Amino acid sequence: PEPLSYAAVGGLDKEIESLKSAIEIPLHQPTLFSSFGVSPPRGILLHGPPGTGKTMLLRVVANTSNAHVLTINGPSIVSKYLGETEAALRDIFNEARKYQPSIIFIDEIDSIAPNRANDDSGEVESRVVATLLTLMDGMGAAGKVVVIAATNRPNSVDPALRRPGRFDQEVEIGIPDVDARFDILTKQFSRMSSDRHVLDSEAIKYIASKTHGYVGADLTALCRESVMKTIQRGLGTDANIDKFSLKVTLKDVESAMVDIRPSAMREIFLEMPKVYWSDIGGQEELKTKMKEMIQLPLEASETFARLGISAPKGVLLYGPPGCSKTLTAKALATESGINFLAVKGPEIFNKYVGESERAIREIFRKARSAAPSIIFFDEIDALSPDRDGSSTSAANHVLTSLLNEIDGVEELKGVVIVAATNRPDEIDAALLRPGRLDRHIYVGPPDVNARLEILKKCTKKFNTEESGVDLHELADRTEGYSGAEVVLLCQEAGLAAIMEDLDVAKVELRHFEKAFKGIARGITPEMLSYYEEFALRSGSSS
Amino acid sequence: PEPLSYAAVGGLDKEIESLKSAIEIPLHQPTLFSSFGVSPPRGILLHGPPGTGKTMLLRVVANTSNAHVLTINGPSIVSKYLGETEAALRDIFNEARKYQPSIIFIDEIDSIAPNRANDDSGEVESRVVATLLTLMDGMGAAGKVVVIAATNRPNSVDPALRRPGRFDQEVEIGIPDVDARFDILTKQFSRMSSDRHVLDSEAIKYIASKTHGYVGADLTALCRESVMKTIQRGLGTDANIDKFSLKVTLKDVESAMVDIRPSAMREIFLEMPKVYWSDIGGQEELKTKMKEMIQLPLEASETFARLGISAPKGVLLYGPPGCSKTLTAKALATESGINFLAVKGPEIFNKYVGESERAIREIFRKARSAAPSIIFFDEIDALSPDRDGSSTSAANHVLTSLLNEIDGVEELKGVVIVAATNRPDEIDAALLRPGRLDRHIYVGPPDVNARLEILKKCTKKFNTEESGVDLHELADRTEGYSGAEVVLLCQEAGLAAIMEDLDVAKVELRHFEKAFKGIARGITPEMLSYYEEFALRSGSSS
């Protein structure tokens, strides 16, 4: 029995500190809030997607805090009929009250008081929510009691429990980021002695990098699976190997990766990978314009206010498919340092009725929470009201929610909305009017310098100068290819290289010639003329 | 009471070894990786389509493991009300814990804790899932207890029992393949003495070949019916035959097949028959091209990585209806030696809203699991968003799932997606953009050499050279035919042969002339123009 400690928790140090404060300020000294004449906040609710580390945090709070732990075991104290159940829970609260200081732990409130939905059994669920409200109505500002709550989904909890003055302090324990994933991995692999874990910190970098979707508990599972497969490699050599100290290795960790893949973020707003400005080929004009028109307003708020001008509220990127738009937004995300929440088009539109408006609401709330922030909307084309009557019940509602959140700049100061599209017309004109998503930047097919840069980025691994191919004739021969077609031309050239030989280490011009014959232009002059005719009708930066 | 052994199980050797490993490492050697610091797995799940051999596997594991088995008999220990039921299951777990080492068998979790669906009676189902989780929360890292549970459909089980750090380890027992079917039949017919079973191993090969949809129990059922129909023939000669040792013959086994088939396999991800490169008439250019751009990337990954190019992810086969597309894909499957998941177009798009999402997610999970693999999407034309508002609820969701899943290059190193559409224009352009299903290959009507080879393959059985018909005048006379049209020309010639005589063994040019009169070209110049037009608009390998 090793008692847990805050060193065991990982990747949540920010909200670890927040929860520690929300426990220490009450439960150790309510006199402070007695002086300031507000009822002390009784009730901290730990949100979070499943497996993020709630229950572990509750256990570590119980172990670390010197107060007395009490538990509402959900069903495990509710009796057959509620007449004894309500008495039992009141008895729990009273026993906490007599032995102040005390903490009441409620796990899985969704399994206790979800009375908003249809599953509210008036004999059971309504009674439980009623008694929760009734006793939560008072424990005494002088009382040294606190209620802590953990739910895998908050909105399932009825709004009645989440009214203010009830348990309403909130700690949003969320999906770990890349650095948080590294923290969790380092702690987990330090739980085992470093002898058996032969992975240098660079290996942990790598495994954290390839564990995008994984959340919390999942990572421990990964480590556990690694153990198993390591043991299996001990048996794969010969069954007679009963010797211990078989090291766990990086290769074992991917071999585990391929098989664990449990429930984690695949229906959550995407955190995109890391790309720098160097990866993007040229387009220095667009790079400068984006750097300015996004990063500068978020880092010049005092200067903008001094000048009597509101900051730009929204920039819309439009260009032929393949040209660097998602990559440019990702690069801005990676090396602008601003919090950057991105959502694909369809992944928010589908979001069956109500879930769409809720999703827009929560994305904007999160954007406001961690200001300054950039909300990236890839393919606004999805959120288009330009369809038949079926769109009136889905597209119109989401469009008007987006409009209502976009406007009202008084509450929007550290938020910039960057949208991307390849079908600019089908973006409802109510969203490209002045005062709204109004700056329009046209990406367009890359110019010759940018194309040459893309070549040099993608042709570097296979010999070019000492293979007799000069990239400039390729660059001026590939006029009109969108950047995707340029990188595909490089890929097809490599495919010809492996065509002619399995272990070749050299790429000739004839391979590029075959590739260039094989690839067809994807940007017809129709599409170009389309984009300038949208440029004339545009609002800003035509 | 014959004791079950692993010799009785068949066609699951890989899964058998995995389960034996997952039962030996705990339950015999907990210390051997309690040192490693991770919590032991402690709870393994056996998936499987109904009748694929779960319950037998549990019985054999019980009868071969020296620990003591305890059975949660589902309802057979659940009482009238859950107050005694939860106590009884706690008592079961405690009696296991005291008598370490112990195994706890849960059969049909779905009949126990399916609380994710509407059939959750909060008095029963919620209580049972709650007591599971609450007791699954702790068994003791040194507690030599293991849970094994089996389900007929996993997703019906809630995510709560399938969180990690929990009842986690999964063993997938699937529909047996052809070789596994041979193994199961060999074991079944060797259970009965070889005297009664007069079928040489070749006959067993044949019967396994023509039992595509049969799974597991079904095959045993087949044997039963064989027995039954065999003794029916014992009564077919004369009722006085009470003599034993009536051999079971092959013909009896097919006569059983015509009746045994229940609804065991549904529109499951399809396994396709075997066709060799020799079967496909000519098309040597397409032979080489497909061989390279599919098999070569999946077998020279290190060379591609060394060269700085990503392997080609997707090949779309577009050709007129009749030319060898599905046949070419099947040939690649059969004699490329790579795992070949393949699902038809209409059988995934038109299932349901969430069912389609789940289908694509699971097909790609399976493709990743057994890498390298080739996902074949025959007739993506079904997955088309080019319809009315009804497509906004079905087509958009399925297409965005496909795009999101195929854009995951970071963990998609050993998968290639091959598609085959007969009208390529109705594929959403987002699925043919570079970086996605992008290499386009045109199959097209067979050239003269291919037509000659097709004839030679289909005319071999009935005499051609010594019948006075030379295949080259046929070959150059049948310009414009699709390959299917050519094989049907051969079939119609045979039909005229059996017209003019019931037991003929000779086909003359006049029969072919009648057939050639009776066949119209299904490949209009309009269709060839359409395909050339899509070629000029394509992305790669135009």
Ligand SMILES: [C][C][C]S(=O)(=O)N1N=[C]C2=C([C]=C([C])S2)[B@@]1([O])O[C]1[C]([O])[C]([C]OP([O])(=O)OP([O])(=O)OP([O])([O])=S)O[C]1N1[C]=NC2=C1N=[C]N=C2[N]
């Ligand atoms: C790993 C690396 C990362 S990245 O770069 O991003 N990538 N990945 C993978 C792949 C590729 C390609 C291929 C063929 S495969 B990559 O490279 O990609 C990239 C990007 O992504 C592209 C484009 O995209 P975006 O951005 O999106 O564009 P768009 O199309 O416009 O949008 P949408 O959504 O579609 S409307 O491409 C590429 N790149 C690179 N670099 C570059 C490019 N492009 C252009 N330009 C340049 N510079």
Ligand SMILES: [C][C][C]S(=O)(=O)N1N=[C]C2=C([C]=C([C])S2)[B@@]1([O])O[C]1[C]([O])[C]([C]OP([O])(=O)OP([O])(=O)OP([O])([O])=S)O[C]1N1[C]=NC2=C1N=[C]N=C2[N]
């Ligand atoms: C038994 C043998 C097997 S198979 O070959 O496959 N078959 N079977 C049956 C039959 C036939 C015919 C008839 C009239 S009856 B068979 O032969 O078939 C075959 C195949 O299958 C066909 C074609 O297919 P595909 O590929 O699929 O086409 P398409 O349309 O493209 O697809 P889809 O689905 O529609 S999109 O035909 C035949 N063959 C054979 N060989 C050949 C052929 N074709 C062509 N070519 C060649 N070489």
Ligand SMILES: Nc1ncnc2c1ncn2[C@@H]1O[C@H](COP(=O)(O)OP(=O)(O)OP(O)(O)=S)[C@@H](O)[C@H]1O
């Ligand atoms: N930093 C961490 N974040 C998350 N989980 C962690 C972390 N460090 C260790 N873990 C392990 O992850 C698991 C977390 O379990 P839980 O706390 O039950 O997850 P969860 O948030 O409770 O999911 P629920 O209770 O179903 S909403 C435990 O096995 C911990 O040992």
Ligand SMILES: Nc1ncnc2c1ncn2[C@@H]1O[C@H](COP(=O)(O)OP(=O)(O)OP(O)(O)=S)[C@@H](O)[C@H]1O
């Ligand atoms: N190798 C084998 N694979 C599958 N079934 C086999 C095999 N060998 C024999 N069988 C027979 O298959 C039958 C299937 O029994 P079960 O294990 O109950 O099937 P099942 O998996 O339990 O189906 P469900 O999911 O419980 S409805 C057994 O009774 C055996 O007689």
